[PDB]
Design a protein around this motif. Sequence first.
Motif, PDB file in Angstrom:
ATOM      1  N   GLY A   1       0.733  -0.970   0.055  1.00  0.00           N
ATOM      2  CA  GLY A   1      -0.061   0.071   0.152  1.00  0.00           C
ATOM      3  C   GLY A   1       0.803   1.365   0.027  1.00  0.00           C
ATOM      4  O   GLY A   1       1.288   1.666   1.057  1.00  0.00           O
ATOM      5  N   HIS A   2       0.895   1.709  -1.140  1.00  0.00           N
ATOM      6  CA  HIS A   2       1.194   3.440  -1.348  1.00  0.00           C
ATOM      7  C   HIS A   2       0.139   4.374  -1.483  1.00  0.00           C
ATOM      8  O   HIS A   2       0.253   5.274  -0.734  1.00  0.00           O
ATOM      9  CB  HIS A   2       2.133   3.621  -2.777  1.00  0.00           C
ATOM     10  CG  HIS A   2       3.234   3.098  -2.846  1.00  0.00           C
ATOM     11  ND1 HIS A   2       3.624   2.761  -4.318  1.00  0.00           N
ATOM     12  CD2 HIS A   2       4.467   2.511  -2.353  1.00  0.00           C
ATOM     13  CE1 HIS A   2       4.901   2.010  -4.147  1.00  0.00           C
ATOM     14  NE2 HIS A   2       5.152   1.719  -2.878  1.00  0.00           N
ATOM     15  N   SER A   3      -0.754   3.961  -1.902  1.00  0.00           N
ATOM     16  CA  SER A   3      -2.034   4.957  -2.466  1.00  0.00           C
ATOM     17  C   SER A   3      -2.977   4.392  -3.308  1.00  0.00           C
ATOM     18  O   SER A   3      -3.121   3.073  -3.360  1.00  0.00           O
ATOM     19  CB  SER A   3      -1.208   6.026  -3.395  1.00  0.00           C
ATOM     20  OG  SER A   3      -1.993   7.199  -3.645  1.00  0.00           O
ATOM     21  N   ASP A   5      -2.598   3.625  -6.167  1.00  0.00           N
ATOM     22  CA  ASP A   5      -1.499   2.843  -6.998  1.00  0.00           C
ATOM     23  C   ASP A   5      -2.245   1.600  -7.914  1.00  0.00           C
ATOM     24  O   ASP A   5      -3.296   1.713  -8.247  1.00  0.00           O
ATOM     25  CB  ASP A   5      -0.246   2.559  -6.249  1.00  0.00           C
ATOM     26  CG  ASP A   5       0.820   2.707  -6.989  1.00  0.00           C
ATOM     27  OD1 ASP A   5       0.717   2.132  -8.345  1.00  0.00           O
ATOM     28  OD2 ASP A   5       1.915   3.004  -6.422  1.00  0.00           O
ATOM     29  N   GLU A   9      -0.994  -5.098  -1.989  1.00  0.00           N
ATOM     30  CA  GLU A   9       0.034  -5.767  -1.001  1.00  0.00           C
ATOM     31  C   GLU A   9      -0.434  -7.096  -0.546  1.00  0.00           C
ATOM     32  O   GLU A   9      -0.395  -7.495   0.580  1.00  0.00           O
ATOM     33  CB  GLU A   9       0.459  -4.989   0.276  1.00  0.00           C
ATOM     34  CG  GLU A   9       1.087  -3.678   0.127  1.00  0.00           C
ATOM     35  CD  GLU A   9       0.428  -2.398  -0.445  1.00  0.00           C
ATOM     36  OE1 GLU A   9      -0.714  -2.389  -0.910  1.00  0.00           O
ATOM     37  N   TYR A  23       0.252  -0.747  -3.854  1.00  0.00           N
ATOM     38  CA  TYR A  23       1.252  -0.406  -4.311  1.00  0.00           C
ATOM     39  C   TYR A  23       1.667  -0.587  -5.789  1.00  0.00           C
ATOM     40  O   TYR A  23       0.775  -0.753  -6.611  1.00  0.00           O
ATOM     41  CB  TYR A  23       2.450  -0.967  -3.446  1.00  0.00           C
ATOM     42  CG  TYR A  23       3.119  -2.388  -3.841  1.00  0.00           C
ATOM     43  CD1 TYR A  23       4.468  -2.329  -3.872  1.00  0.00           C
ATOM     44  CD2 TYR A  23       2.372  -3.276  -3.852  1.00  0.00           C
ATOM     45  CE1 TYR A  23       5.112  -3.536  -4.209  1.00  0.00           C
ATOM     46  CE2 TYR A  23       2.773  -4.661  -4.338  1.00  0.00           C
ATOM     47  CZ  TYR A  23       4.193  -4.745  -4.440  1.00  0.00           C
ATOM     48  OH  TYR A  23       4.760  -5.814  -4.887  1.00  0.00           O
ATOM     49  N   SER A  24       3.076  -0.328  -6.355  1.00  0.00           N
ATOM     50  CA  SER A  24       3.206  -0.072  -7.908  1.00  0.00           C
ATOM     51  C   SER A  24       3.597  -1.676  -8.282  1.00  0.00           C
ATOM     52  O   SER A  24       3.910  -2.622  -8.586  1.00  0.00           O
ATOM     53  CB  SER A  24       4.516   0.789  -8.083  1.00  0.00           C
ATOM     54  OG  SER A  24       5.541   0.516  -7.146  1.00  0.00           O
TER      55      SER A  24
END
Length: 24
Positions: A1-3, A5, A9, A23-24
């Motif tokens: 988890g970034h955003s 994205d 995860e 996440y990316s």
Amino acid sequence: GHSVDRIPEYFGPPGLPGPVLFYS
């Protein structure tokens, strides 16, 4: 988890009833 994205995860598949982050 970034955003908001692209790849999760590794929480589970999509279409869960709770919230989610990526996440990316």
